[PDB]
């Protein structure tokens, strides 16, 4: 219990394993007396194995008291221990046959059927006991007596031979007499022709008869010259016959322990080298079967494990605390299914002990082998052959796979995870008063959660003598303890999150607040990153207790903090929905209002201007002011457009110097609640334009500045939102459309009128219709904005613009990228990625691909000078410094070129999006990357699954292989594409493309057309690409950017936003493996590139996240992937041991996870006082 081990590793379980593993062998199928309801001694559930019922009491009870332990008892036979060892203990039964394991038999590939060369559909004939094999054969006596067998059998089919003759004559002669007869007797054509031609059908018989014994005869002497070991006998007739005669020149025998024979006198080394011939030509399946079956055949060489495990001579029993029978509600009692399904098993092996004894024949005895083998397969996998050993009610019982898989109806693959204490949930309601960092937090849920807190305080005050009477003055409510829940909870992080969870915002860290009432209050920012509409929706509340758990909460889980998308950088605390409403009216402007400024005449002077924002406040509160009037006031604490201020000063800043704008009130007030070094807007805050500052403030302050900004902006937008007047009613929603479209749909009537004949003209019409609806659609618009003015309720909050499946791609998206973190600083790579880059005479997705990234080399400018240097943060001043200079393309460092030899760098990799600084080393980038993409799942799906999986395109498109021109041929069967290479070489035709999978498009812009150039990589047709096509004609790093290039481009369509740096993350793993050619090492298992590069014939290789991810370096994080039969199959055999370098693998085990704080810098720390300090 040292909670840190290095390595785990599995392998076959011999019956010796077993046999020491086991506490003694259960021998009766029993589990309790159904009088005394007490565990049946020798059976289930027996004391005197598997452990006492009570703590250190015995069975009897002349052993009760602690004094006796690690004693057994003479007369029961218990060791007096605790009653845990009842859950630790194992037994096992000894087997009166062998029998097979059914994962080494069944399993496909067949562990047994490659091993020893035995089809599966013949292998299961064996051990079922369906056919018999030969086993040993004796070659000398064969060949010495070969001579005498040949002369006695071919006299016995002689003698049968003379029989057919012999029997044949004497019954054709005998039919003449009869015919003798006839000729004297009544004649006719008829009555002798029926006998005739029924003696002819008699005759027919006496030669198949004899001949079909011929036959018979024949086939034993044929099998007995080539007899020969493992072959197979299904006749069983024959094989009698075959063991009547030359009954000692060979053995056989039926079911598994014919299986485990073979294997006894089995060379594994001399069986490896007839399968090491790559020679005898196997240019197609012949030599693949060779090969693919000696991964099974070396697997056993190569370790001491000896392929005898597949056979047991004993099975192991499962503790029974994991199979338990206890007493249900109401007297009713329950149990496990194993317990019926290992009483199964040892049922029949005891019978079979009973016909061995009663020395009975080999029908039954073979029989009741068979039902042993299935009851051993039952017992380990139900189902997989067969129908299910079903309970009452027809249901399948649950075998040790099921058990083991997680299966409940169908899977539960621990996505279930596991319950929590102090943890709780409730109804969540709107926390418009709260802060950022804050949540409302119900007084009971706050007592309990933290009653152990309480508890303590309670008892280090003398209101409570000792803790237990403190539990009751807690559990009672004494209004005592109110004032000591607010110590507790002060300063202490509480963490949220509310299913289902998509990305790492889902959980959130808060302060929690002793709140009136049962409800939850959440912060109205938080919900768009916890997806939280307030109808009838809960979240759960989770209390962190260690001094490490509190300190990731307050740092890396704090609601303030996690401001940015860590999927696209932008910012999702940004106000919405009222406060965009609200800000929207506050800081809009409305010419002809109260206060309106007036230019000063010869009469009077100007009458707009104030002194300062307080007086206009005074004004405003007078019927003097409107809020959205064009007054210019003079502002001091407020800081100037930075286009202005040059002008006006250009001698620095102006804390306490004046200046004179003309704004509106409610844009002065606006600009308050902005830090104050953030210069003035003046401006009517749109959606966009929000959105557009909270990105420069994240920028150019830290955080805290920007969470209490946006906290700043919540009670403006909310405040105002009330004072905007937004209400709606008939009038605002009422539809003059009734008159506009009743005369529109009589126009398209009357062309019923023209179709029918005189004027359809087949394309006017089409274009009549599709015109006349969007003349409608137009005057339908104009309509719209035609009866309401621009202050419209539903027109002002357009304006503003404050208006399940997918779980399944998530988990293999993290299946394949967990381990994906980042390992060390910089691996100095001087090669990355080409970014397009405002095309001018501006790309939209430069922000995806370009933004937030580090450059590999300088960017030069034509003119000599150097702008933005390599390693630079490349930020969005940097793109517009760029764009002002001109140039087109930059190369960037990216975590496809990375070169670290584990997980990525931080330079390749870049901007963290949430934190916007630099990536930090622990940051587990594949989950973070894998949750970004797997989020927008709620042309589409199934399109994205395809790309990831690495399939064949629906609909395949061609590539050209090489570069020239191009020749266009169209034909009815389809169209032809012929490249004319530029080298001279032969030409490269694409033959048979249906018609419809329409051609690709294109200074002069256009569609491809017939002399075209074409380059390597110009995808001829429209459509998807095969990747594995791409991926030998371009190279591995163009598949890349081809694969990132689609999935981006899906995304798009429907308006995702996620930086190419996630994409590229998963798409990093896909390529990683080679495949090794042939023989140095052998054959083409999906290896590693870092593995095989950096030690010394292989090929790159495209591979499906699912595929790639069951590849991984541990078994038992690919056994929860997918399918852990067949993993742990192979994972046994070549005794494969798992490092626990995943953090899957420390997860299961309870382990810390290498990554974030469980690295090995982070977590072996050293924290001492300075001596500067200390004497202090
Ligand atoms: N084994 C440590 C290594 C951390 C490091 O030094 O980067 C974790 O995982
Ligand atoms: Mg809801
Ligand atoms: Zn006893
Ligand atoms: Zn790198």
């Given at each position: 219990?040292?909670?840190?081990?290095?390595?785990?590793?599995?392998?076959?379980?011999?019956?010796?394993?077993?046999?020491?593993?086991?506490?003694?062998?259960?021998?009766?199928?029993?589990?309790?007396?159904?009088?005394?309801?007490?565990?049946?001694?020798?059976?289930?559930?027996?004391?005197?194995?598997?452990?006492?019922?009570?703590?250190?009491?015995?069975?009897?009870?002349?052993?009760?008291?602690?004094?006796?332990?690690?004693?057994?008892?003479?007369?029961?036979?218990?060791?007096?221990?605790?009653?845990?060892?009842?859950?630790?203990?194992?037994?096992?039964?000894?087997?009166?046959?062998?029998?097979?394991?059914?994962?080494?038999?069944?399993?496909?590939?067949?562990?047994?059927?490659?091993?020893?060369?035995?089809?599966?559909?013949?292998?299961?004939?064996?051990?079922?006991?369906?056919?018999?094999?030969?086993?040993?054969?004796?070659?000398?006596?064969?060949?010495?007596?070969?001579?005498?067998?040949?002369?006695?059998?071919?006299?016995?089919?002689?003698?049968?031979?003379?029989?057919?003759?012999?029997?044949?004559?004497?019954?054709?002669?005998?039919?003449?007499?009869?015919?003798?007869?006839?000729?004297?007797?009544?004649?006719?054509?008829?009555?002798?022709?029926?006998?005739?031609?029924?003696?002819?059908?008699?005759?027919?018989?006496?030669?198949?008869?004899?001949?079909?014994?011929?036959?018979?005869?024949?086939?034993?002497?044929?099998?007995?010259?080539?007899?020969?070991?493992?072959?197979?006998?299904?006749?069983?007739?024959?094989?009698?016959?075959?063991?009547?005669?030359?009954?000692?020149?060979?053995?056989?025998?039926?079911?598994?322990?014919?299986?485990?024979?073979?294997?006894?006198?089995?060379?594994?080394?001399?069986?490896?080298?007839?399968?090491?011939?790559?020679?005898?030509?196997?240019?197609?399946?012949?030599?693949?079967?060779?090969?693919?079956?000696?991964?099974?055949?070396?697997?056993?060489?190569?370790?001491?494990?000896?392929?005898?495990?597949?056979?047991?001579?004993?099975?192991?029993?499962?503790?029974?605390?994991?199979?338990?029978?206890?007493?249900?509600?109401?007297?009713?009692?329950?149990?496990?299914?194993?317990?019926?399904?290992?009483?199964?098993?040892?049922?029949?092996?005891?019978?079979?002990?009973?016909?061995?004894?009663?020395?009975?024949?080999?029908?039954?005895?073979?029989?009741?082998?068979?039902?042993?083998?299935?009851?051993?397969?039952?017992?380990?996998?139900?189902?997989?052959?067969?129908?299910?050993?079903?309970?009452?009610?027809?249901?399948?019982?649950?075998?040790?796979?099921?058990?083991?898989?997680?299966?409940?109806?169908?899977?539960?693959?621990?996505?279930?995870?596991?319950?929590?204490?102090?943890?709780?949930?409730?109804?969540?309601?709107?926390?418009?008063?709260?802060?950022?960092?804050?949540?409302?937090?119900?007084?009971?849920?706050?007592?309990?959660?933290?009653?152990?807190?309480?508890?303590?305080?309670?008892?280090?005050?003398?209101?409570?003598?000792?803790?237990?009477?403190?539990?009751?003055?807690?559990?009672?409510?004494?209004?005592?303890?109110?004032?000591?829940?607010?110590?507790?909870?002060?300063?202490?992080?509480?963490?949220?999150?509310?299913?289902?969870?998509?990305?790492?915002?889902?959980?959130?860290?808060?302060?929690?607040?002793?709140?009136?009432?049962?409800?939850?209050?959440?912060?109205?920012?938080?919900?768009?990153?916890?997806?939280?509409?307030?109808?009838?929706?809960?979240?759960?509340?989770?209390?962190?207790?260690?001094?490490?758990?509190?300190?990731?909460?307050?740092?890396?889980?704090?609601?303030?903090?996690?401001?940015?998308?860590?999927?696209?950088?932008?910012?999702?605390?940004?106000?919405?929905?009222?406060?965009?409403?609200?800000?929207?009216?506050?800081?809009?402007?409305?010419?002809?209002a109260t206060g309106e400024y007036q230019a000063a005449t010869k009469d009077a002077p100007e009458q707009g201007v104030y002194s300062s924002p307080a007086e206009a406040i005074m004004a405003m509160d007078r019927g003097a002011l409107s809020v959205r009037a064009k007054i210019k006031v003079r502002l001091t604490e407020l800081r100037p457009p930075t286009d202005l201020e040059a002008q006006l000063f250009e001698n620095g800043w102006k804390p306490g110097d004046a200046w004179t704008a003309e704004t509106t009130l409610g844009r002065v007030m606006f600009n308050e609640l902005l830090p104050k070094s953030y210069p003035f807007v003046n401006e009517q805050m749109h959606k966009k334009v929000q959105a557009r500052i909270i990105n420069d403030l994240a920028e150019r302050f830290p955080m805290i500045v920007v969470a209490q900004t946006v906290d700043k902006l919540k009670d403006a937008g909310f405040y105002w939102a009330t004072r905007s007047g937004v209400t709606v009613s008939m009038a605002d929603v009422l539809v003059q459309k009734q008159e506009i479209?009743?005369?529109?749909?009589?126009?398209?009537?009357?062309?019923?009128?023209?179709?029918?004949?005189?004027?359809?003209?087949?394309?006017?019409?089409?274009?009549?219709?599709?015109?006349?609806?969007?003349?409608?659609?137009?005057?339908?618009?104009?309509?719209?904005?035609?009866?309401?003015?621009?202050?419209?309720?539903?027109?002002?909050?357009?304006?503003?613009?404050?208006?399940?499946?997918?779980?399944?791609?998530?988990?293999?998206?993290?299946?394949?990228?967990?381990?994906?973190?980042?390992?060390?600083?910089?691996?100095?790579?001087?090669?990355?990625?080409?970014?397009?880059?405002?095309?001018?005479?501006?790309?939209?997705?430069?922000?995806?691909?370009?933004?937030?990234?580090?450059?590999?080399?300088?960017?030069?400018?034509?003119?000599?000078?150097?702008?933005?240097?390599?390693?630079?943060?490349?930020?969005?001043?940097?793109?517009?410094?760029?764009?002002?200079?001109?140039?087109?393309?930059?190369?960037?460092?990216?975590?496809?070129?990375?070169?670290?030899?584990?997980?990525?760098?931080?330079?390749?990799?870049?901007?963290?999006?949430?934190?916007?600084?630099?990536?930090?080393?622990?940051?587990?980038?594949?989950?973070?990357?894998?949750?970004?993409?797997?989020?927008?799942?709620?042309?589409?799906?199934?399109?994205?699954?395809?790309?990831?999986?690495?399939?064949?395109?629906?609909?395949?498109?061609?590539?050209?292989?090489?570069?020239?021109?191009?020749?266009?041929?169209?034909?009815?069967?389809?169209?032809?594409?012929?490249?004319?290479?530029?080298?001279?070489?032969?030409?490269?035709?694409?033959?048979?493309?249906?018609?419809?999978?329409?051609?690709?498009?294109?200074?002069?812009?256009?569609?491809?057309?017939?002399?075209?150039?074409?380059?390597?990589?110009?995808?001829?047709?429209?459509?998807?690409?095969?990747?594995?096509?791409?991926?030998?004609?371009?190279?591995?790093?163009?598949?890349?950017?081809?694969?990132?290039?689609?999935?981006?481009?899906?995304?798009?369509?429907?308006?995702?936003?996620?930086?190419?740096?996630?994409?590229?993350?998963?798409?990093?793993?896909?390529?990683?493996?080679?495949?090794?050619?042939?023989?140095?090492?052998?054959?083409?298992?999906?290896?590693?590139?870092?593995?095989?590069?950096?030690?010394?014939?292989?090929?790159?290789?495209?591979?499906?996240?699912?595929?790639?991810?069951?590849?991984?370096?541990?078994?038992?994080?690919?056994?929860?992937?997918?399918?852990?039969?067949?993993?742990?199959?192979?994972?046994?055999?070549?005794?494969?041991?798992?490092?626990?370098?995943?953090?899957?693998?420390?997860?299961?085990?309870?382990?810390?996870?290498?990554?974030?704080?469980?690295?090995?810098?982070?977590?072996?720390?050293?924290?001492?006082?300075?001596?500067?300090?200390?004497?202090?």
């Amino acid at each position: 219990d040292v909670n840190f081990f290095d390595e785990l590793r599995i392998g076959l379980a011999t019956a010796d394993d077993i046999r020491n593993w086991s506490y003694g062998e259960v021998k009766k199928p029993e589990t309790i007396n159904y009088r005394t309801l007490k565990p049946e001694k020798d059976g289930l559930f027996c004391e005197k194995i598997f452990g006492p019922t009570r703590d250190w009491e015995c069975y009897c009870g002349k052993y009760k008291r602690v004094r006796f332990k690690g004693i057994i008892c003479e007369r029961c036979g218990v060791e007096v221990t605790r009653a845990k060892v009842r859950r630790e203990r194992m037994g096992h039964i000894e087997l009166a046959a062998p029998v097979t394991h059914i994962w080494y038999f069944k399993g496909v590939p067949s562990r047994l059927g490659y091993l020893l060369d035995l089809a599966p559909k013949d292998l299961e004939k064996i051990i079922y006991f369906a056919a018999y094999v030969i086993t040993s054969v004796d070659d000398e006596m064969r060949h010495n007596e070969l001579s005498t067998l040949e002369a006695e059998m071919a006299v016995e089919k002689k003698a049968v031979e003379d029989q057919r003759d012999a029997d044949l004559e004497a019954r054709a002669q005998k039919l003449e007499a009869d015919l003798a007869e006839l000729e004297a007797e009544g004649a006719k054509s008829d009555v002798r022709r029926k006998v005739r031609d029924s003696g002819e059908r008699e005759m027919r018989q006496l030669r198949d008869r004899a001949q079909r014994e011929l036959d018979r005869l024949d086939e034993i002497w044929n099998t007995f010259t080539k007899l020969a070991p493992k072959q197979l006998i299904v006749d069983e007739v024959l094989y009698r016959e075959l063991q009547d005669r030359y009954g000692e020149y060979f053995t056989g025998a039926m079911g598994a322990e014919s299986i485990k024979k073979l294997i006894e006198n089995f060379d594994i080394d001399a069986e490896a080298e007839s399968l090491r011939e790559v020679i005898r030509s196997g240019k197609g399946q012949k030599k693949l079967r060779a090969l693919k079956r000696l991964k099974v055949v070396a697997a056993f060489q190569q370790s001491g494990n000896s392929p005898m495990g597949m056979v047991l001579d004993a099975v192991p029993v499962i503790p029974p605390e994991l199979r338990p029978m206890v007493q249900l509600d109401g007297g009713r009692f329950a149990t496990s299914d194993l317990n019926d399904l290992y009483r199964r098993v040892i049922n029949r092996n005891n019978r079979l002990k009973r016909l061995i004894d009663l020395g009975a024949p080999e029908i039954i005895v073979n029989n009741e082998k068979r039902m042993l083998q299935e009851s051993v397969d039952a017992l380990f996998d139900n189902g997989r052959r067969g129908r299910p050993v079903t309970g009452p009610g027809n249901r399948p019982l649950k075998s040790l796979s099921d058990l083991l898989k997680g299966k409940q109806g169908r899977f539960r693959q621990n996505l279930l995870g596991k319950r929590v204490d102090y943890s709780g949930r409730s109804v969540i309601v709107v926390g418009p008063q709260l802060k950022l960092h804050q949540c409302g937090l119900p007084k009971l849920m706050a007592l309990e959660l933290f009653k152990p807190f309480v508890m303590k305080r309670l008892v280090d005050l003398n209101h409570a003598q000792n803790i237990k009477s403190a539990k009751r003055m807690v559990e009672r409510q004494r209004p005592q303890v109110w004032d000591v829940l607010e110590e507790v909870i002060a300063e202490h992080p509480v963490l949220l999150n509310r299913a289902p969870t998509l990305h790492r915002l889902g959980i959130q860290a808060f302060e929690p607040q002793l709140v009136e009432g049962k409800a939850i209050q959440l912060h109205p920012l938080v919900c768009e990153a916890f997806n939280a509409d307030f109808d009838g929706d809960q979240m759960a509340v989770h209390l962190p207790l260690s001094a490490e758990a509190q300190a990731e909460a307050r740092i890396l889980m704090l609601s303030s903090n996690n401001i940015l998308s860590p999927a696209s950088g932008k910012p999702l605390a940004m106000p919405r929905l009222d406060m965009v409403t609200g800000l929207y009216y506050l800081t809009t402007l409305v010419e002809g209002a109260t206060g309106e400024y007036q230019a000063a005449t010869k009469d009077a002077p100007e009458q707009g201007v104030y002194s300062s924002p307080a007086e206009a406040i005074m004004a405003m509160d007078r019927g003097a002011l409107s809020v959205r009037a064009k007054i210019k006031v003079r502002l001091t604490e407020l800081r100037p457009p930075t286009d202005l201020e040059a002008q006006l000063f250009e001698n620095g800043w102006k804390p306490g110097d004046a200046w004179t704008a003309e704004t509106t009130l409610g844009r002065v007030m606006f600009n308050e609640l902005l830090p104050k070094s953030y210069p003035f807007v003046n401006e009517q805050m749109h959606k966009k334009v929000q959105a557009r500052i909270i990105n420069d403030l994240a920028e150019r302050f830290p955080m805290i500045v920007v969470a209490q900004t946006v906290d700043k902006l919540k009670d403006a937008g909310f405040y105002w939102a009330t004072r905007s007047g937004v209400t709606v009613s008939m009038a605002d929603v009422l539809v003059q459309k009734q008159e506009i479209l009743e005369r529109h749909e009589a126009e398209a009537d009357a062309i019923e009128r023209k179709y029918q004949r005189g004027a359809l003209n087949h394309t006017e019409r089409n274009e009549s219709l599709v015109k006349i609806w969007q003349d409608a659609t137009e005057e339908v618009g104009k309509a719209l904005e035609e009866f309401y003015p621009a202050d419209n309720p539903i027109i002002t909050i357009v304006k503003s613009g404050a208006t399940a499946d997918s779980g399944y791609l998530t988990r293999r998206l993290v299946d394949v990228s967990q381990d994906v973190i980042v390992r060390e600083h910089d691996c100095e790579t001087e090669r990355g990625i080409n970014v397009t880059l405002a095309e001018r005479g501006r790309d939209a997705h430069v922000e995806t691909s370009a933004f937030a990234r580090t450059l590999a080399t300088d960017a030069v400018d034509a003119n000599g000078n150097v702008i933005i240097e390599r390693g630079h943060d490349l930020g969005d001043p940097a793109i517009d410094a760029l764009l002002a200079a001109g140039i087109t393309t930059v190369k960037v460092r990216s975590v496809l070129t990375c070169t670290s030899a584990t997980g990525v760098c931080a330079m390749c990799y870049g901007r963290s999006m949430a934190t916007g600084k630099l990536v930090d080393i622990g940051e587990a980038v594949g989950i973070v990357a894998a949750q970004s993409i797997g989020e927008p799942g709620t042309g589409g799906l199934p399109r994205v699954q395809e790309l990831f999986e690495a399939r064949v395109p629906r609909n395949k498109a061609p590539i050209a292989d090489v570069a020239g021109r191009v020749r266009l041929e169209e034909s009815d069967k389809f169209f032809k594409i012929t490249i004319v290479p530029d080298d001279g070489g032969e030409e490269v035709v694409y033959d048979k493309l249906s018609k419809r999978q329409r051609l690709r498009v294109i200074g002069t812009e256009g569609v491809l057309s017939d002399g075209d150039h074409v380059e390597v990589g110009d995808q001829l047709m429209e459509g998807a690409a095969d990747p594995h096509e791409v991926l030998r004609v371009q190279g591995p790093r163009e598949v890349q950017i081809h694969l990132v290039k689609e999935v981006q481009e899906v995304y798009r369509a429907q308006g995702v936003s996620i930086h190419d740096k996630h994409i590229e993350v998963i798409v990093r793993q896909m390529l990683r493996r080679v495949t090794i050619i042939d023989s140095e090492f052998l054959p083409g298992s999906l290896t590693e590139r870092a593995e095989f590069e950096a030690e010394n014939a292989g090929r790159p290789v495209l591979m499906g996240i699912t595929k790639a991810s069951l590849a991984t370096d541990s078994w038992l994080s690919a056994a929860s992937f997918q399918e852990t039969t067949r993993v742990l199959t192979d994972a046994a055999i070549n005794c494969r041991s798992d490092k626990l370098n995943g953090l899957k693998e420390n997860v299961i085990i309870g382990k810390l996870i290498p990554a974030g704080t469980g690295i090995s810098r982070y977590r072996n720390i050293q924290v001492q006082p300075t001596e500067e300090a200390r004497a202090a």
